Amino acid sequence: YIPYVKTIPKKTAIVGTVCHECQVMPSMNDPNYHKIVEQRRNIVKLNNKERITTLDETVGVTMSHTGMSMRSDNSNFLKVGREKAKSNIKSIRMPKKEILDYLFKLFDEYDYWSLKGLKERTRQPEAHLKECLDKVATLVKKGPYAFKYTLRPEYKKL
Amino acid sequence: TTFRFCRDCNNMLYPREDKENNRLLFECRTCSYVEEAGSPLVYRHELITNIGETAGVVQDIGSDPTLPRSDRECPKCHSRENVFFQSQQRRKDTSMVLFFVCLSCSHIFTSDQKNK
Amino acid sequence: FHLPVRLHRKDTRNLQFQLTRAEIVQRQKEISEYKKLRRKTRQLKVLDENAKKLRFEEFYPWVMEDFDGYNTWVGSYEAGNSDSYVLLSVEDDGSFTMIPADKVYKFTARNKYATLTIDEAEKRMDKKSGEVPRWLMKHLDNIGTTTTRYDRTRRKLKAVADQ
Amino acid sequence: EVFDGNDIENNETKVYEESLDLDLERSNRQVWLVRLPMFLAEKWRDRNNLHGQELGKIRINKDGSKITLLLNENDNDSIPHEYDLELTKKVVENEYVFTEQNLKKYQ
Amino acid sequence: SLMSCISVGTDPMPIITFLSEWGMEPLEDYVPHQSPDATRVFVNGVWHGVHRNPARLMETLRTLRRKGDINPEVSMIRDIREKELKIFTDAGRVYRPL
Amino acid sequence: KGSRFISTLQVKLYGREGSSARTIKATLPYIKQDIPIVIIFRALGIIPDGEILEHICYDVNDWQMLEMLKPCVEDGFVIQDRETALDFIGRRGTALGIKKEKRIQYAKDILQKEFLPHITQLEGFESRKAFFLGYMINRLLLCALDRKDQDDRDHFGKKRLDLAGPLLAQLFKTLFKKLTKDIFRYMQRTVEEAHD
Ligand SMILES: [Zn+2]
Ligand SMILES: [Zn+2]
């Protein structure tokens, strides 16, 4: 047998059995008769779709919003560059006299720290920030935790 | 030839032989349902077939405006109106015999005088 | 039908080796006795909500099975007259009650004649022999292979009643 | 509403507080399957209506063989007030009406 | 030819709805052995249903087309011998007046 | 209206008049092999052979027509349910992207969106597809038994003339489809490359 079938239980009940099949047809001897016939005839007569509208305005005006136009787009649609490019700020290098303590406290928190987070947390230029990181930590590229800086074993093993 | 169908699952019943009675029984191949055969015929190959000669005759065949009319007398009701059409078998081996359908009794007869 | 009867939505793939409700109940009794990164840019095709709801709702067809598994019917959704019917219910007083109809389902019995398996069917389709034996099912029935859930459950139930 | 399959662990005793077996109490109930025209079906299948009011009466001859429907005067004299119910099948078998609804999920 | 014309086509849905309301039983409940005299109904080559009284249906449809309710380009053929009723609405058919 | 693509379905009667067994097989898109008609009929939800013959032949006394249909049922006797038939249809499909789990659904999807698309493409219309297939088989058998002549290729009634309207319609749709793809490509590039 199979141990799993993945059923979906529900509350069901039989509320009757069909015994007679009927077809409702209006009697032809009714005063309101022949009104449904007109209604039925109107079904085919109907034309839901509408024809394409023709612009009667001057052709020069209609084409003013095409090609190289003096008008500038005011839409805010798919402005991904604008959304993120707005955020930009510089930061000065916090001297080794100060940030040296920051890194070791940072490493003590977690033992595998990425480059992108390090620049964000330190908020310093990557140029000098590299020198301290290489002097204290090392990066493993070929390991499973590839491209992540970790504190050197000399100081970690303490 | 008649193809009997199963009572319990609607599947066709093929012929089987019972040596205990040496009779013909139709049995099902899936649900094991048996029934005694009424005829000893099992295969009917018809190289020269007369079926389909009058195929397509309906209760309102005369309403067809393309079918030709004729004045031949129907030999069951003494009527003169009728429509005639050639054999509906399209194989190029059939004769040009006609088949007349009466518009008063829906009877089908033929004008052939060789075999009738 | 052999009461009680269950009518639920369930997967019908391999609807020949699934445990019967009676078997499950028996299994419970013995068990108690025994214990005693993505692409970041994806395009989706637009689909009307109604069909998607129908597709998701109708993914698992209705299955009607009795307690002993003797009757096993699987339903299929029919759209020919799903919304063109209006059911009428007559109460036990001579009056008539109006109830609109929602859907129509077509149910067919299953496993009445011990169908074969996919591997067995494929092998027979191949050129294993000139033609399948006229009584192949009968021969395999005696061997005991290719049985039905009703027969499969009955033997197991009898195997327990004997002890 | 996904749930386990065979459920050999007997998880339905606590997951659902209602019996999962099909109910046959209302099986012994006659039902008529009736197909309605477009104009009549467009107003009887609407959920913004059908509050339990009397839509008409059904008249059956004493000897049978003829069934007619008489609607009330609420149609606004826009459709016929009399209809003929043609019995397409006097004897019908292998047809049933079943309902379904959700089950309690707690305890 | 001089009087030849090519149809532009119209929606076949209104015709199908009209047929259903006039006794065109749906194909879902058609039992061939229970009525081996009914005429099949085709619309644009699609088998939509069957009719028990083709004569009346054709007479009604023909009158409707002549009265101008159905598009004149629609073609109606009733093969009495074959027990079929074909209605064509797709564009590309060449017709002439008579 | 809706996709403007053409899918061809062929029903073939294998064997010659001198053959002891002539079977009927149908060609389905994206399947690579010809399947017996009975297997397809079962895949649509009609497992009993009695109904399948009823769907094909509309006369209970036309024993001659039924005789030629016996070989078909014998060929596909081993398959007797929707799941087995659906799996048999699916494994022939040229997808190879589904290991085994979606194989049953893949065949069902093919029979729904790529089998006789001119009838319908929505779920719940298996009966209509089954009935139409029987009509094609019925027409095939009638010609094979010499009851009807092969359809004339020059019969103008079966010919269609495309004027400027339909011609430009096809050209416009293809060009518009190309335009839509170009629009999407720019959106993807703009998001990925961070442009305006
Ligand atoms: Zn049987
Ligand atoms: Zn006569």
UniProtKB/Swiss-Prot annotation, chain B:
Lineage, highest ranks first: Eukaryota, Fungi, Dikarya, Ascomycota, Saccharomycotina
Places the protein is found: Nucleus, Nucleolus
The family this protein is said to belong to: Belongs to the archaeal RpoM/eukaryotic RPA12/RPB9/RPC11 RNA polymerase family.
Main function: DNA-dependent RNA polymerase catalyzes the transcription of DNA into RNA using the four ribonucleoside triphosphates as substrates. Component of RNA polymerase II which synthesizes mRNA precursors and many functional non-coding RNAs. Pol II is the central component of the basal RNA polymerase II transcription machinery. It is composed of mobile elements that move relative to each other. RPB9 is part of the upper jaw surrounding the central large cleft and thought to grab the incoming DNA template. Involved in the regulation of transcription elongation.
PROSITE patterns: RNA_POL_M_15KD, ZF_TFIIS_1, ZF_TFIIS_2
Zn finger intervals (C4-type): 6-31
Disulfide partners: none
Matching InterPro entries: DNA-dir_RNA_pol-M_15_CS, Rpa12/Rpb9/Rpc10/TFS, Zn_ribbon_RPB9, Zn_ribbon_RPB9_C, Znf_TFIIS
ZnF segments: TFIIS-type: 70-110
Keyword vocabulary terms for this entry: DNA damage, DNA repair, DNA-directed RNA polymerase, Metal-binding, Nucleus, Phosphoprotein, Transcription, Zinc, Zinc-finger
Source organism of this protein record: Saccharomyces cerevisiae (strain ATCC 204508 / S288c) (Baker's yeast)
Pfam family, one: Zn_ribbon_TFIIS
UniProt cross-references to Gene3D superfamilies, sorted A to Z: 2.20.25.10
Top-level taxon in the UniProt lineage: Eukaryota
PANTHER family membership: DNA-DIRECTED RNA POLYMERASE, DNA-DIRECTED RNA POLYMERASE II SUBUNIT RPB9
GO cellular component, one term: RNA polymerase II, core complex
SMART domains per record: RPOL9, ZnF_C2C2
Phosphoserine: residues bearing it: 39
Protein name per its UniProtKB record: DNA-directed RNA polymerase II subunit RPB9
Keyword Signal: no
UniProtKB/Swiss-Prot annotation, chain C:
Segments passing through the bilayer: none
Entry comment on modification after translation: Phosphorylated on Ser and other residues by TAF1 and casein kinase II-like kinases.
Subcellular location: Nucleus
Top-level taxon: Eukaryota
More about this protein: Present with 1920 molecules/cell in log phase SD medium.
Free-text function comment from the UniProt entry: TFIIF is a general transcription initiation factor that binds to RNA polymerase II. Its functions include the recruitment of RNA polymerase II to the promoter bound DNA-TBP-TFIIB complex, decreasing the affinity of RNA polymerase II for non-specific DNA, allowing for the subsequent recruitment of TFIIE and TFIIH, and facilitating RNA polymerase II elongation.
Family: Belongs to the TFIIF alpha subunit family.
Name assigned to this protein: Transcription initiation factor IIF subunit alpha
The organism of origin for this protein: Saccharomyces cerevisiae (strain ATCC 204508 / S288c) (Baker's yeast)
Biological classification of the source: Eukaryota, Fungi, Dikarya, Ascomycota, Saccharomycotina
Full protein segment contained here: 133 to 451 of 735
Curated annotation (Swiss-Prot), chain D:
Biased composition (Acidic residues): 1-10
SS bond partners: none
Localization terms from the record: Nucleus
Residues modified as Phosphoserine: 19
Family: Belongs to the TFIIF beta subunit family.
Misc note: Present with 520 molecules/cell in log phase SD medium.
Quaternary structure note: TFIIF is composed of three different subunits: TFG1/RAP74, TFG2/RAP30 and TAF14.
Protein name in UniProt: Transcription initiation factor IIF subunit beta
Source organism of this protein record: Saccharomyces cerevisiae (strain ATCC 204508 / S288c) (Baker's yeast)
Species lineage: Eukaryota, Fungi, Dikarya, Ascomycota, Saccharomycotina
Annotated gene: TFG2
Included range, full protein: 38 to 144 of 400
Swiss-Prot record, chain F:
UniProt source species: Saccharomyces cerevisiae (strain ATCC 204508 / S288c) (Baker's yeast)
Source taxon at top rank: Eukaryota
Family from the record: Belongs to the RNA polymerase beta chain family.
Subunit structure: Component of the RNA polymerase II (Pol II) complex consisting of 12 subunits.
Note: The binding of ribonucleoside triphosphate to the RNA polymerase II transcribing complex probably involves a two-step mechanism. The initial binding seems to occur at the entry (E) site and involves a magnesium ion coordinated by three conserved aspartate residues of the two largest RNA Pol II subunits. Present with 18700 molecules/cell in log phase SD medium.
Protein name (Swiss-Prot/TrEMBL): DNA-directed RNA polymerase II subunit RPB2
Subcellular location: Nucleus
Purpose: DNA-dependent RNA polymerase catalyzes the transcription of DNA into RNA using the four ribonucleoside triphosphates as substrates. Second largest component of RNA polymerases II which synthesizes mRNA precursors and many functional non-coding RNAs. Proposed to contribute to the polymerase catalytic activity and forms the polymerase active center together with the largest subunit. Pol II is the central component of the basal RNA polymerase II transcription machinery.
